[PDB]
Amino acid sequence: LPIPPTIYTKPSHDSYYYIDALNRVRRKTYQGPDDVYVPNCSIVELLEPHETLTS
Amino acid sequence: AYIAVPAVVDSRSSEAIGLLESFGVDAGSDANDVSYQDHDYVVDQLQYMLDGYEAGDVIDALVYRNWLHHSVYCLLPPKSQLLEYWKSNPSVIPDNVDRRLRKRLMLKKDLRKDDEYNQLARAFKISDVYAPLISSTTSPMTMIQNLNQGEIVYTTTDRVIGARVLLYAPRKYYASTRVPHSRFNVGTFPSIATPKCSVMSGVDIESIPNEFIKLFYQRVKSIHANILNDISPQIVSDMINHVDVYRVDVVNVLFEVVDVADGLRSVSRKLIMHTVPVCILELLGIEIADYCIRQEDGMFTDWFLLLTMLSDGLTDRRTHCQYLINPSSMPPDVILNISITGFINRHTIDVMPDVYDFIKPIGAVLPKGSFKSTIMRVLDSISVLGVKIMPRAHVVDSDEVGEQMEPTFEHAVMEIYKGIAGVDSLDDLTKWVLNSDLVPHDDRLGQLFQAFLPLAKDLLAPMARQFYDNSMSEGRLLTFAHADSELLNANYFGHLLRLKIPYITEVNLMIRKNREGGELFQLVLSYLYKMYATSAQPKWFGSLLRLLICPWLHMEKLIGEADPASTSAEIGWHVPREQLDGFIPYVSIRAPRLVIEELMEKNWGQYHAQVIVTDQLVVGEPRRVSAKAVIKGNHLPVKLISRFACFTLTSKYEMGAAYNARLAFRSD
């Protein structure tokens, strides 16, 4: 069955989080106040490789 | 002689406090004949013994106790540990026990297998050796007569009362853990034991603060009321002939309402006014003569207003009911002239409330028609020791959260009339809800409250969350607001003080001019806030002003003449490095020299936070810029300041990125 290609290409995560006035890290809701969960995006860039597992 | 007062007495500190003068007894010679008796231990034994018995048995035992006859307990080890204490050091054995068992205690043999020592120890009981031996289950009435007759009393339990408790054995033997009298002895817990025992009149049972002394005195007045010896303070004075703050002397005044409006004297009403502080009456020069409480436009004279706001509510003398005066000058009754007659009691209260534990903001809840701007203008003009007590610059009005919204909440709830079917105008709504008596119908309020609740739950609460979070970020503030569920639905951090003015609010609503909309709409809206709030019994308003004002007057009496450098202090956040030394004020302290030199070595390095400094300097004269500080760990307890020093409650944060600073002490 077909798989859509939009899974593999997802944008960066910087626009989804912000800082409250009491320095509380809370996430920005776009579709309802129940949209407070983990985004699905861009994990390759904030990363450092293992010392013997090079991949 | 024996006299009983409603206070915790000790032989040590009660004379340095000046307790009888604090009740009003004039003993000014200081001929040191009034010997005291410490009652800390009998209050604590009362606390421990109310666990085990009925309060009826407890109080009816404790009453019949001669406090002049000295006696003392000595409690014992248990029955199977007392023989072990008799085994080592066999010299300390009373001559009563047995010549058959004494010879078997005093020998050196290990007595491992006991063939007749087993029988001599099982048949042994303590009751034929020690003569009182109260019990574990003694019905504690008989304890008191045992201590009145003898002077040493043996017991086997802990829950005893009346005297101190000495140990018979050293401390490793247990499994449960003389006095100068000079004929004018005073101290609490009356006695019916002897003639010449007296009980102090004056203060009501209703207004005793310790609540165990109050329970005791309620019982000792509910029985034995005919056989007491009630004497006034003046009779006590004729029979005779680390200074603490947050403990005011307090009286009640006994004025009345009078008119001279036709050139004739005529008394109309009869009033009493509870818990007014003595220091403010000494400040204002209040005496017996005729006073007038209006000036030139119908507004109260700014000292009677401070007097009524400073204390709790009024009370009628004829009906014994709560009374609220008319702030308006339009009479079914008005009060123009009064006349003060006398003062009735002289107890002392802790000004510090129980709810005040940590340094955190204060949320006051008032109704709509409280004297907000006038009480703020009165508290603005107070400056005791160079510091202003409650500045306007960090107090929050009730409508400040309502005026920042773009549909501007009062203007938003003016537009409620379109949802209702048959009113279709604001003036028609204000006519329809009311009776033409200004007490409204309940069904119109129910329909309008069902229309009003989505406006107050949805379009107010997250804006209130953002506002009170912003105000908590920019300092430690004090927020006047309404309808305490406005502080409960929006999650407000800080203390909560439900308060109530001593005046009628609903007539105060419709006197003011140029307010928002019609005054009838303001009164309807006030009723909707009052219906919205809770069912909690609020308080009177007097406690918060007593806390604000009255501790600084004792400090002005104490350290009004020393130096500001060595008697001032300052605490706040402190960041080590220097880029484009850093310090933010958090709390200021006035105290004497010994108190500050005790304050310096306390562990102020436990609490830490995040400190954010911006670059918008403001109109104030020294080089200091606004900032923000957000506390992270635990909060600062008030014991870690003091009981004795006097500090400011609420302040602002004025000195960029985060800094992670830690707070410290500084003085001269």
Side-chain angles (χ1 to χ4, degrees):
Chain A
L1 80 162
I3 297 169
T6 62
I7 290 98
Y8 294 101
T9 63
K10 296 297 287 183
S12 296
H13 64 89
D14 57 353
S15 67
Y16 292 163
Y17 292 170
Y18 65 94
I19 300 171
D20 198 356
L22 277 298
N23 296 114
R24 289 190 295 267
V25 178
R26 63 181 295 164
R27 71 182 303 277
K28 187 176 178 182
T29 66
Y30 291 165
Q31 295 177 357
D34 206 1
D35 188 2
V36 280
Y37 290 105
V38 185
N40 49 3
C41 59
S42 293
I43 202 163
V44 69
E45 70 272 16
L46 47 86
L47 194 148
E48 184 177 2
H50 191 270
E51 68 273 16
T52 189
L53 295 174
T54 62
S55 295
Chain B
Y2 183 76
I3 299 169
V5 294
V8 176
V9 294
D10 58 351
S11 65
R12 178 72 271 168
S13 296
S14 298
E15 182 65 29
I17 296 169
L19 184 62
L20 274 301
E21 184 181 1
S22 178
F23 288 111
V25 172
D26 193 2
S29 296
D30 197 1
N32 66 12
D33 51 357
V34 184
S35 294
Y36 292 169
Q37 294 179 356
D38 53 348
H39 288 167
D40 293 328
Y41 64 95
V42 296
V43 169
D44 291 331
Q45 286 171 355
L46 181 64
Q47 180 69 257
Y48 183 75
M49 196 174 74
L50 288 175
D51 193 4
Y53 293 102
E54 185 179 0
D57 293 332
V58 167
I59 305 305
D60 291 331
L62 184 59
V63 168
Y64 291 163
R65 173 59 178 268
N66 192 1
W67 293 99
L68 298 177
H69 181 75
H70 181 75
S71 295
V72 64
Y73 293 98
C74 57
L75 85 164
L76 295 172
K79 184 180 183 294
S80 295
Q81 198 175 7
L82 181 140
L83 295 174
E84 284 77 354
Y85 180 70
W86 285 354
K87 182 66 179 293
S88 298
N89 191 2
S91 67
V92 281
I93 294 172
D95 54 352
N96 289 315
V97 284
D98 192 355
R99 66 177 175 89
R100 187 180 64 190
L101 190 144
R102 179 179 299 275
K103 185 178 179 180
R104 188 58 66 85
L105 289 181
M106 290 177 71
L107 83 161
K108 187 59 67 69
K109 186 174 71 68
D110 52 359
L111 53 91
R112 295 295 93 193
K113 182 62 69 178
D114 294 328
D115 291 331
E116 63 178 357
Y117 179 69
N118 195 3
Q119 183 179 2
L120 265 67
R122 289 179 69 251
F124 182 76
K125 289 180 182 179
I126 303 172
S127 296
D128 60 357
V129 174
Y130 292 157
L133 191 62
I134 305 174
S135 81
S136 179
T137 61
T138 187
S139 70
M141 186 67 203
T142 185
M143 294 182 180
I144 300 297
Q145 289 90 20
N146 290 318
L147 270 70
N148 288 129
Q149 291 177 357
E151 69 273 14
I152 189 68
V153 173
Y154 295 95
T155 186
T156 185
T157 187
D158 195 5
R159 53 180 75 258
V160 297
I161 196 169
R164 292 180 180 177
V165 180
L166 294 176
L167 276 295
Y168 183 76
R171 298 295 189 273
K172 65 179 74 174
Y173 292 99
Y174 294 94
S176 68
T177 63
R178 192 265 303 160
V179 59
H181 62 88
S182 64
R183 79 189 163 88
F184 285 166
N185 292 310
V186 78
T188 186
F189 292 163
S191 55
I192 295 298
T194 30
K196 302 292 284 189
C197 285
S198 303
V199 191
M200 178 73 162
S201 178
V203 65
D204 195 358
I205 306 299
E206 179 71 20
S207 297
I208 297 172
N210 204 173
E211 79 187 356
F212 292 98
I213 297 173
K214 180 177 179 178
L215 179 63
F216 183 80
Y217 287 175
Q218 191 270 333
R219 181 61 179 268
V220 178
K221 297 293 178 67
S222 182
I223 310 178
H224 299 284
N226 291 317
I227 63 169
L228 293 175
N229 297 114
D230 292 331
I231 54 174
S232 72
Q234 293 84 17
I235 300 301
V236 182
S237 67
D238 292 331
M239 286 178 183
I240 299 304
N241 297 114
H242 290 171
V243 175
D244 200 3
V245 193
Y246 297 98
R247 293 179 65 88
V248 296
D249 293 331
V250 70
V251 299
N252 306 328
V253 309
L254 191 64
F255 65 96
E256 66 184 1
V257 176
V258 65
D259 56 350
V260 292
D262 291 331
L264 273 301
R265 179 70 180 268
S266 177
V267 176
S268 67
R269 297 294 301 273
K270 290 182 180 181
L271 293 176
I272 195 171
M273 183 175 179
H274 297 284
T275 181
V276 294
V278 179
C279 297
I280 302 296
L281 295 177
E282 293 180 354
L283 190 147
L284 295 175
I286 300 300
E287 63 184 2
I288 306 298
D290 294 332
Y291 291 162
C292 182
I293 61 168
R294 300 291 180 92
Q295 58 93 30
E296 185 65 28
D297 59 358
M299 189 63 205
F300 294 97
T301 57
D302 292 331
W303 62 269
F304 181 77
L305 187 63
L306 182 63
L307 187 62
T308 56
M309 295 297 175
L310 184 64
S311 68
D312 65 354
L314 296 171
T315 301
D316 191 359
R317 288 184 288 173
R318 298 294 295 163
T319 64
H320 295 285
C321 295
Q322 295 296 323
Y323 182 71
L324 303 176
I325 74 170
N326 190 4
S328 176
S329 66
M330 298 183 67
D333 54 347
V334 294
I335 302 170
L336 184 63
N337 298 113
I338 62 170
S339 67
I340 299 169
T341 61
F343 297 166
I344 192 166
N345 56 3
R346 185 67 184 272
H347 65 282
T348 58
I349 61 171
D350 191 3
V351 182
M352 185 66 81
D354 196 4
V355 69
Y356 187 80
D357 194 3
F358 294 99
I359 305 297
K360 64 177 72 174
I362 298 169
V365 177
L366 292 174
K368 179 73 182 291
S370 296
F371 286 176
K372 294 182 182 292
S373 64
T374 308
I375 197 63
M376 287 167 69
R377 185 181 61 83
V378 171
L379 57 83
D380 195 4
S381 298
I382 303 298
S383 65
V384 177
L385 294 176
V387 63
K388 191 180 288 186
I389 301 302
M390 190 65 208
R392 187 179 173 87
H394 62 275
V395 61
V396 175
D397 195 0
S398 66
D399 58 352
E400 290 180 356
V401 65
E403 293 295 327
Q404 67 181 358
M405 291 183 283
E406 295 294 327
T408 176
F409 182 74
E410 293 179 353
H411 292 275
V413 299
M414 286 175 73
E415 297 293 327
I416 197 168
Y417 63 95
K418 297 184 294 297
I420 304 298
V423 293
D424 69 3
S425 179
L426 190 146
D427 291 331
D428 189 76
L429 188 144
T430 59
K431 189 262 179 184
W432 180 63
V433 174
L434 275 306
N435 200 6
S436 69
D437 190 1
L438 294 171
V439 175
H441 297 284
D442 291 332
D443 50 353
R444 281 94 173 95
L445 290 179
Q447 185 177 2
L448 203 153
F449 183 75
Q450 292 179 358
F452 180 77
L453 180 61
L455 293 175
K457 183 60 67 69
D458 292 331
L459 295 175
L460 190 145
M463 296 296 172
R465 289 180 183 91
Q466 295 297 110
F467 182 73
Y468 292 117
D469 285 333
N470 193 3
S471 296
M472 185 178 71
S473 65
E474 294 178 353
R476 184 178 65 248
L477 279 75
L478 189 147
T479 62
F480 288 160
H482 297 161
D484 57 351
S485 61
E486 293 183 355
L487 281 302
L488 269 74
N489 294 126
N491 297 115
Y492 180 72
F493 182 75
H495 295 293
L496 191 144
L497 294 175
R498 294 178 178 90
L499 295 172
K500 180 175 71 176
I501 190 173
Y503 295 173
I504 297 171
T505 63
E506 292 86 4
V507 63
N508 189 22
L509 262 305
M510 68 186 75
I511 297 302
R512 294 180 184 271
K513 297 295 289 183
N514 297 115
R515 295 294 301 274
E516 180 65 35
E519 296 296 328
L520 294 175
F521 181 73
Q522 294 293 319
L523 178 132
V524 170
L525 177 137
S526 70
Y527 288 165
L528 265 298
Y529 289 120
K530 186 182 286 187
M531 185 178 175
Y532 180 72
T534 40
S535 66
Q537 182 69 41
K539 200 180 280 290
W540 294 99
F541 185 71
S543 73
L544 189 144
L545 287 186
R546 189 175 62 245
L547 184 64
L548 290 177
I549 298 170
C550 292
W552 292 96
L553 275 75
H554 295 284
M555 189 60 72
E556 184 179 1
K557 184 175 89 273
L558 186 61
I559 309 300
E561 292 85 4
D563 52 346
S566 295
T567 63
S568 297
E570 183 65 35
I571 298 163
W573 296 101
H574 185 272
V575 57
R577 53 87 163 161
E578 293 180 354
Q579 299 291 323
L580 76 162
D581 196 359
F583 179 72
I584 295 174
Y586 183 76
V587 61
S588 68
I589 291 179
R590 296 293 185 270
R593 182 66 178 170
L594 191 147
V595 173
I596 297 171
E597 293 295 326
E598 181 66 29
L599 288 179
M600 186 178 288
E601 69 273 16
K602 292 179 71 68
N603 289 319
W604 293 96
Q606 292 181 357
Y607 296 98
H608 64 280
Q610 294 299 110
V611 170
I612 295 95
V613 175
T614 178
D615 56 352
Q616 289 85 18
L617 73 162
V618 79
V619 72
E621 294 294 325
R623 56 176 185 89
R624 86 285 183 274
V625 66
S626 66
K628 291 181 181 179
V630 174
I631 189 165
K632 296 293 181 182
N634 292 320
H635 296 281
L636 185 63
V638 67
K639 65 98 184 178
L640 203 146
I641 298 171
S642 69
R643 180 67 183 272
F644 293 157
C646 187
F647 61 97
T648 184
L649 293 176
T650 58
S651 67
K652 291 179 71 67
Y653 293 165
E654 292 179 354
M655 179 66 76
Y659 291 103
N660 193 1
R662 297 175 71 251
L663 79 161
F665 182 76
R666 61 183 59 192
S667 66
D668 192 2

